[PDB]
Design a protein around this ligand. Structure first.
Ligand SMILES: [Ca+2]
Lengths: 223, 58
């Protein structure tokens, strides 16, 4: 997260870290046994870390649970990045209380201008590298499909949306993928891709979760 | 030629932070770099062994 702020210990209870010997992607807990992430975050041997703040130190609120299933959307296209969503089933149910909680799926899509919360342990620099110990937060608005397509000609599908500031300086970045974009308590997006990070006229692109609600519910229920 | 082993490492547009290896001809060794998760170029390996086998001596 570039241009953001320190969320504060466990203030984003649905945020999880995907670990494969180190943190490589984020994710969103939507059920005690399921996490939503990006399809490009698929890896074997994934361990989901919940209740995390400082990802480099054990603080006492963490739950480390292995992924028992990592289901990439059947139509994910690794070239166009269309349908960039993945469902991860936890080997054992996560313990929910206050520092670890699920986030609701959307009942309807969000409109341009809606302010959302984006979070993650990704790079905090637009030029250079600096990975944070604690979770970072960013408030950013969903942008119009028209502005998104103008920013990324011939690259934006109906399953993607842009969010951020065209002036640059605030954006998600490497290490944030698979993470949440929550608007009004609903998970509307998944950190997906973009041209660099926090660059002018290059807002982040996110998977449009509202288009996958029925698929998510049915897939989770059939696995 | 164009030897893909001589191409600079490519992170790509996706936002993951996956550690991969690339052959660094300038240093004569396989080094680590951050791969974003998609649109990988060929000088991108999952292990130093894979990198050395494919690009060693480039
Ligand atoms: Ca920790």
């Amino acid at each position: 997260i570039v241009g953001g702020y320190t969320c504060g210990a466990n203030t984003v209870p649905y945020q999880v870290s995907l670990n494969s010997g180190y943190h490589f992607c984020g994710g969103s807990l939507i059920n005690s046994q399921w996490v939503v992430s990006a399809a490009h975050c698929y890896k074997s041997g994934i361990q989901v870390r919940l209740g995390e703040d400082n990802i480099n130190v054990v603080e006492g609120n963490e739950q480390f649970i292995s992924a028992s299933k990592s289901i990439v959307h059947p139509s994910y296209n690794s070239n166009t990045l269309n349908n960039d969503i993945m469902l991860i089933k936890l080997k054992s149910a996560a313990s929910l209380n206050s520092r670890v909680a699920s986030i609701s799926l959307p009942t309807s899509c969000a409109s341009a201008g809606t302010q959302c919360l984006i979070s993650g342990w990704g790079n905090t620099k637009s030029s250079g590298t600096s990975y944070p110990d604690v979770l970072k937060c960013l408030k950013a608005p969903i942008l119009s499909d028209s502005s998104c397509k103008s920013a990324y000609p011939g690259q934006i599908t109906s399953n993607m949306f842009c969010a951020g500031y065209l002036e640059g300086g605030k954006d998600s970045c490497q290490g944030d993928s698979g993470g949440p974009v929550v608007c009004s308590g609903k998970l509307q997006g998944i950190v997906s891709w973009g041209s660099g990070c926090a660059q002018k006229n290059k807002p982040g692109v996110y998977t449009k979760v509202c288009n996958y609600v029925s698929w998510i519910k049915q897939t989770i229920a059939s696995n | 030629r164009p030897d893909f082993c001589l191409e600079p490492p490519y992170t790509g547009p996706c936002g993951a932070r996956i550690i991969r290896y690339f052959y660094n001809a300038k240093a004569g060794l396989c080094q680590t770099f951050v791969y974003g998760g998609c649109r990988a170029k060929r000088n991108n390996f999952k292990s130093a062994e894979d990198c050395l086998r494919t690009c060693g001596g480039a």
